[PDB]
Design a protein around this ligand. Structure first.
Ligand SMILES: Nc1ncnc2c1ncn2[C@@H]1O[C@H](COP(=O)(O)OP(=O)(O)OP(=O)(O)O)[C@@H](O)[C@H]1O
Ligand SMILES: Nc1ncnc2c1ncn2[C@@H]1O[C@H](COP(=O)(O)OP(=O)(O)OP(=O)(O)O)[C@@H](O)[C@H]1O
Ligand SMILES: Nc1ncnc2c1ncn2[C@@H]1O[C@H](COP(=O)(O)OP(=O)(O)O)[C@@H](O)[C@H]1O
Ligand SMILES: [Mg+2]
Lengths: 440, 278, 219, 50, 352
């Protein structure tokens, strides 16, 4: 309420001179006196300039203990203005960026965190310093501690911190969580990001980071359709689509995973949408795979392995392979998965037609011995996938639901009604033709 | 022409937008009270093959009487959130109206609308506005209030034990009610809502601070232990003033000092009897 | 809330009418204008000046007070033993002053129906305000200004409540700076502090049992 | 009135137990509750007098 | 223009009013039950070009007089009484004129103003902002002045009432006024209700009493249940004001209805100096004016008393027929107003 600008501006040069000369104590004491006077006067700017002056002087003294103590005392100075504390903290943050000594860095960062715990006026800085400390504990080969220190920060809440830093902080959290080999926390952390944010002005590197972290997440237990969705989003990214190799690999992954997916309405609609992709021509064998999985006709595993066996698993120099079916353990798992999907599509296709099919003939056509085909059918039925009754005593597999008389008569009625409508339509076409040819 | 069962003016809770927003989990403790209020408006609704095997006639309504601020209108609010039956809410100060024959008309209209919808709850908050024992039947106004009260009794006694219309009313002074309400057949349960004891104080603190940031430093056992007769509404002002101070100092965490100041703010201790007694 | 006249059958407003005040309020208004000069009161020569300066001076020469940058006083209360010259001074002021006078009596604002005394007071202040600057003379102010207390006996609460309303009217929200108040009481030891407060009833004036010179003057 | 209340309380407790019969244990608990509330009312009246 | 007004009047003469009544239910696509304000209920039709989706069970509607055909919908009625409660004029007091209250004004703004701009803080800490605060303290301290400052400076709507002007003779009319006032506030969010002298209707509910006492207690039960009842109040704030907090219903002081109990006591020495400075500013003065002397001769005074010190100081200055206020006139004023204080009964009441 009472100006002190002239006093502080005059004094400060002398204080810096005396400090650099070696009069640190006297200059610090006089600065504390001016700070108390100003703060009782409630001068935010003068207090901030004085506080920054003190923090700067002390650092060019190798007085780590003196610097940290002075930071503490300044923070707890009574009636201390929040803006002054924030400026002092941003200075300390720059400095923590500068300093290099491992113990000095760690101690200064801890002091900055303690003075920076729980305060809006300094809230960005806390997240930044926590990110720095998580980095430091991470490249020291300690991952759990990095994960905890990072997860302790609730980025979303901060209303001042800009969006891009929020997303980058979340993404660091997710990468660390995947590293620590825990996933449930990752699912929890994923929903917190907004997928719509990755459309606004520039979110290109962050977008690819998010989608790669998911694809690594969903491969853990198997969510092939979700992974196809994410690869598709990556393919839609302009940067990937601009270069040939990037978008071609995007489509390779998307088609292979839609293939690997469990059959259902969503996967059917997705495969139908992907199939009508003019760019798909570039990948000949892969579009062959797509059609084969959309055409309704039995397919033999033998033919698929003989033709596309090498183009998928062992890769091609002209057409790059993908980690989808590499030699890793997950490669064998997904190869089993593709076997499973061909078998299930075969079962469904004969499950549209084929009211009855002897167990031996189904097993022969599916390329399995009797027992394994029977087990596969039993599991499918128990899971509600398809409907069928195995008459193990006679070796028959009936695909027909019961026909209650109510349904039988209802079908009869639908048939009559369609007959009536076709009679009406044929009469309309007759009237039209007679009009076109009879007036003459 | 004969119209649908009720034109009515006592609109019934839309149970769509006007449904309150207090879950059973917002409350803490009052397990016994929850039981009785639910056990008295649901247990007769279920079964009934066991409520005339032991000859005890089923309850008609519930009186909820307790000190001023221990959760009387909270529980009604929750049982209005969760319950599936129709809900009609009134305040006894609303029946009393200017013209003669209008108070009785409103009472009859309310109970008739309830009877129309088999599952229904009628809540009459602050029944003290009507059922006051003492009367001065010499001024008319008191005569009309007595008329409303008698109409309530006559409507309550007009049931067949086979209609699922229940009534619950809350009062801050049960003793001031007339006995005609307490007689069996009418209101058959009284549910005390006493000031919290230690265990309830702990539960309500935990449940009300559960939404806080509440750094781990704070040890609520200290606040609950204090031998201070505090009502549940206060236990929410301590937890609110704590965060208030937090925001005053521009934080988003609550320290032990903040809570201490809150408790010293909300519980001002009575004028210490000069210590030359004792 | 205005007062308009409407057609008997088309219900179309047709004219604006003067505001309605309870007849009881309207009867409080002065019509006769008593005639008692400032010579007829002797022995109260300081008190008369105090009251004249407080009530009449602002109304005529407001320029002086505006120049000094001071709000004039709010209210005047006259207290003295019975027969010490209270109502006579006010009657004289009404005789010489020209602004609208309103008479009253403490017991005139107590009505049986709850909420009627307050309505009386509110409408009286309203009429005083509307009819140019004016003074209100509440004689026997001790009837309604009694101290409040915690007792189980009812009835007094209604008088206390119209007293609260009068308190608020004098100095409260929506400041009133056109009406001035007078009062007279034999007992000032029973009037509420919120009514003797230094903002509602500012100038309080004592009326002593007349001294020898005063007795000769009166005779 | 206390001995009239103990009966209804005990019956209602037995009902919560989901039975057709009241039990001696149930009666004991009901009478404990009713007498506890009676003594609570008496001491509340005493405190009000205080 | 005269002929335009004449023809406007002549056209206006041929036109009829519409009975205003409330729709209670929509029987069929062209059948509505309407309760005309007088009381008679009708079954009536509806004009063909009218959004029948806006006639919910409760909309106010203007019925033609002959056929009683619904013809227009209207927003909820605003009683003239509430129109006056909502169009007061607290002068233009600013927070400057309030001297000697700093902590109290901060608490008040925290309660009513902060949640109306900066709710995000309350969401971050995780609390619902408090609703209303009682201003209790010895007479002449600044309660009403604070409320007028809050009304004029702040930007939300205001409602001002004296609890002694709610009450009405006919049974069940004061309660209806309170209920309709709070409905109005519930409509025009945000809004602040300032109940002045809530002791006029907030009084302990006795077991034994008379008919009028019981009627006022019914009004008070209505208020209590409007504050914190079945319907959460949300975004309307309250402030009361009493010199007798003690004589109030314990259910009204409960810390869910009146969250903060701010004490506004008599000024202290520094505060006295502030108020004296605030009031003595616009005077035209000569010579030195050592406010320490008056602060020393004005023990026990209140804001009004120091304002009166200034007024009396000018009165004395005119009495001498000068054109200024000198120090000696201040000393005379202070000593005088010290003499008049012997009549007021000095004591304070607390909420216990
Ligand atoms: N067990 C509880 N858990 C949480 N909040 C509670 C609990 N008991 C009471 N409250 C608080 O009670 C406040 C509301 O009080 P309520 O309306 O229930 O009062 P009441 O007992 O009906 O009062 P009155 O007798 O004056 O009508 C809510 O703010 C809620 O915080
Ligand atoms: N100082 C005086 N000068 C002239 N007349 C006086 C004086 N004192 C008293 N009187 C006479 O006293 C008579 C009655 O006194 P009055 O009623 O005017 O006084 P009051 O103090 O207002 O009394 P009350 O308490 O009864 O209202 C009047 O006729 C007036 O003539
Ligand atoms: N702190 C203050 N600053 C300035 N004036 C004050 C103060 N306190 C009281 N007053 C004076 O008192 C009057 C306001 O009365 P107020 O305190 O609002 O109501 P109450 O009668 O309830 O105390 C005004 O005339 C004002 O000048
Ligand atoms: Mg007289």
């Amino acid at each position: 309420e009472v100006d002190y600008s002239a006093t502080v501006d005059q004094r400060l040069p002398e204080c810096a001179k005396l400090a650099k000369e070696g009069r640190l104590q006297e200059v610090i004491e006089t600065l504390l006196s001016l700070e108390k006077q100003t703060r009782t006067a409630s001068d935010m700017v003068s207090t901030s300039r004085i506080l920054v002056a003190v923090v700067k002087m002390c650092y060019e003294a190798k007085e780590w203990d003196l610097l940290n103590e002075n930071i503490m005392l300044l923070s707890k100075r009574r009636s201390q203005l929040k803006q002054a504390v924030a400026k002092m903290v941003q200075q300390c943050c720059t400095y923590v960026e500068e300093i290099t000594d491992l113990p000095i860095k760690l101690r200064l960062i801890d002091t900055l965190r303690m003075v920076t715990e729980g305060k809006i006026y300094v809230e960005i800085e806390r997240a930044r310093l926590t990110k720095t400390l998580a980095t430091i504990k991470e490249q020291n080969g300690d991952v759990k501690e990095a994960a905890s220190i990072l997860q302790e920060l609730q980025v979303e809440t901060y209303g001042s911190m800009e969006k891009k830093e929020r997303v980058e902080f979340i993404l660091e959290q997710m990468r660390l969580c995947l590293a620590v080999k825990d996933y449930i926390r990752t699912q929890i952390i994923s929903k917190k990001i907004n997928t719509k944010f990755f459309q606004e002005e520039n979110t290109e590197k962050l977008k690819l980071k998010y989608y790669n972290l998911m694809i690594q997440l969903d491969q853990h237990e198997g969510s092939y359709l979700s992974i196809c969705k994410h690869y598709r989003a990556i393919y839609d990214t302009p940067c990937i689509q601009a270069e040939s190799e990037k978008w071609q690999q995007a489509l390779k992954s998307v088609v292979l995973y839609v293939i690997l997916a469990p059959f259902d309405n969503e996967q059917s609609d997705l495969v139908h949408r992907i199939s009508g992709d003019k760019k798909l021509e570039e990948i000949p064998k892969y579009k062959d795979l797509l059609k084969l999985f959309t055409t309704m006709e039995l397919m033999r595993w033998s033919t698929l392995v003989e033709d596309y066996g090498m183009e998928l698993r062992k890769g091609s120099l002209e057409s790059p392979a993908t980690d989808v079916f590499g030699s890793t353990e997950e490669g064998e798992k997904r190869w089993k998965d593709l076997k499973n999907r061909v078998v299930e599509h075969n079962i469904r296709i004969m499950a549209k037609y084929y009211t009855r099919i002897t167990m031996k003939r189904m097993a022969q056509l599916l390329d399995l011995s009797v027992d394994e085909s029977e087990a596969f059918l039993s599991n499918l039925v128990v899971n509600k996938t398809i409907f069928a009754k195995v008459d193990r005593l006679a070796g028959i597999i009936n695909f027909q639901r019961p026909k209650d008389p109510n349904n039988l008569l209802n079908d009869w009625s639908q048939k009559l009604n369609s007959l009536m409508s076709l009679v009406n339509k044929t009469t309309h076409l007759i009237a039209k033709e007679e009009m076109i040819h009879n007036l003459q | 022409d004969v119209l649908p069962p009720e034109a009515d003016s006592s609109i019934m809770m839309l149970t769509s937008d006007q449904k309150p927003d207090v879950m059973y989990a917002d409350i803490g403790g009052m397990d016994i009270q929850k039981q009785e209020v639910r056990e008295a408006v649901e247990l007769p609704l279920t079964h009934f093959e066991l409520y005339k095997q032991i000859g005890i006639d089923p309850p008609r309504g519930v009186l909820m009487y307790g000190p001023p601020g221990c959760g009387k209108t909270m529980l009604a609010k929750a049982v209005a959130h969760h319950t599936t039956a129709a809900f009609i809410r009134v305040v006894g100060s609303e029946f009393v109206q200017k013209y003669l024959g209008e108070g009785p008309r409103m009472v009859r209209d309310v109970f008739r609308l309830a009877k129309e919808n088999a599952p229904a709850i009628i809540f009459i908050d602050e029944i003290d506005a009507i059922a006051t024992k003492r009367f001065d039947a010499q001024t008319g106004a008191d005569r009309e209030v007595q008329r409303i009260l008698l109409e309530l009794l006559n409507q309550m006694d007009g049931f067949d034990q086979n209609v699922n219309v229940k009534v619950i009313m809350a009062t801050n002074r049960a003793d001031t009610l007339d006995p005609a309400l307490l007689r069996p057949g009418r209101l058959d349960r009284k549910i005390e809502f006493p000031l919290p004891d230690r265990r309830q104080k702990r539960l309500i603190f935990s449940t009300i601070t559960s939404k806080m940031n509440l750094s781990e430093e704070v040890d609520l056992e200290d606040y609950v232990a204090r031998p201070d007769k505090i009502s549940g509404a206060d236990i929410n002002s301590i937890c609110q003033e704590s965060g208030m101070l937090a925001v005053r100092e521009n934080r988003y965490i609550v320290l032990a000092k903040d809570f201490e100041k809150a408790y010293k703010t909300v519980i001002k201790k009575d004028e210490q009897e000069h210590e030359f007694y004792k | 809330g205005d007062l308009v006249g409407v057609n008997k059958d088309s219900y179309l407003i047709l004219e604006t009418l003067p505001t309605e005040y309870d007849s009881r309020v309207k009867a409080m208004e002065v019509d006769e204008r008593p005639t008692e000069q400032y010579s007829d009161i002797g022995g109260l020569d300081k008190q008369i000046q105090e009251l004249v300066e407080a009530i009449v001076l602002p109304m005529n020469h407001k320029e002086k007070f505006e120049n000094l940058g001071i709000q004039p006083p709010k209210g005047v209360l006259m207290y003295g033993p019975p027969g010490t010259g209270k109502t006579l001074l006010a009657r004289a002021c009404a005789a010489q002053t020209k602004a609208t006078f309103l008479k009253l009596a403490g017991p005139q604002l107590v009505q049986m129906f709850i909420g009627d005394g307050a309505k009386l007071v509110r409408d009286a202040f309203a009429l005083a305000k509307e009819k140019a600057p004016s003074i209100i003379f509440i004689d026997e102010l001790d009837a309604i200004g009694t101290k409040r207390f915690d007792s189980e006996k009812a009835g007094d609460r209604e008088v206390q409540r119209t007293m609260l309303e009068l308190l608020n009217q004098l100095d409260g929200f929506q400041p009133n700076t056109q009406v001035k108040v007078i009062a007279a009481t034999n007992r000032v030891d029973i009037l509420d502090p919120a009514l003797l407060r230094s903002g509602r009833l500012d100038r309080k004036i004592e009326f002593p049992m007349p001294n020898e010179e005063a007795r000769a003057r009166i005779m | 009135a206390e001995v009239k209340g103990v009966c209804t309380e005990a019956g209602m407790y037995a009902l919560r137990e989901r039975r057709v019969h009241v039990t001696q244990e149930d009666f004991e608990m009901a009478v404990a509750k009713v007498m506890q509330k009676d003594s609570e009312k008496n001491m509340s009246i005493k405190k009000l007098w205080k | 223009k005269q002929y335009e007004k004449s023809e406007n009047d002549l056209k206006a003469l041929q036109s009829v009013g519409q009975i205003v009544g409330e729709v209670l239910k929509q029987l069929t696509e062209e059948k509505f039950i309407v309760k005309a304000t007088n009381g008679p209920r009708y079954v009536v039709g509806c004009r063909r070009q009218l959004d029948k989706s806006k006639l919910k069970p409760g909309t106010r509607v203007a019925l033609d007089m002959t056929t009683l055909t619904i013809m227009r919908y209207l927003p909820r009625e605003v009683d003239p009484l509430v129109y006056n409660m909502s169009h007061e004029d607290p002068g233009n007091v600013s927070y400057s004129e309030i001297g000697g209250l700093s902590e109290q004004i901060r608490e008040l703004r925290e309660v009513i103003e902060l949640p109306l701009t900066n709710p995000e803080l309350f969401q971050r800490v995780g609390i619902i902002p408090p609703k209303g605060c009682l201003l209790y303290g010895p007479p002449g301290t600044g309660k009403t002045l604070l409320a007028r400052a809050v009304a004029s400076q702040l930007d939300c709507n205001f409602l001002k009432v004296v609890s002694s002007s709610i009450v009405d003779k006919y049974i069940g009319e004061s309660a209806r006024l309170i209920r309709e006032m709070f409905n109005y506030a519930r409509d025009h969010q945000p809004c602040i209700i300032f109940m002045d002298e809530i002791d006029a209707i907030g009084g302990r509910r006795f077991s034994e009493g008379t008919s009028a006492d019981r009627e006022i207690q019914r009004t008070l039960m209505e208020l209590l249940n409007q504050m914190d009842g079945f319907d959460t109040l949300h975004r309307v704030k309250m402030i009361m004001a009493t010199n007798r907090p003690d004589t109030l219903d314990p259910a009204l002081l409960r810390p869910g209805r009146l969250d903060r109990k701010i004490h506004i006591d008599l000024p202290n020495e520094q505060a006295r100096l502030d108020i004296l400075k605030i009031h003595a500013g616009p005077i035209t003065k000569h010579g030195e004016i050592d406010y320490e002397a008056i602060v020393k001769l004005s023990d026990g005074f209140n804001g009004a008393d120091l304002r009166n010190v200034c007024t009396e100081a000018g009165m004395f200055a005119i009495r001498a027929d000068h054109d200024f206020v000198v120090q000696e006139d201040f000393m005379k004023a202070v000593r005088k107003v010290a003499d008049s204080k012997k009549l007021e009964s000095k004591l304070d009441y607390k909420p216990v």
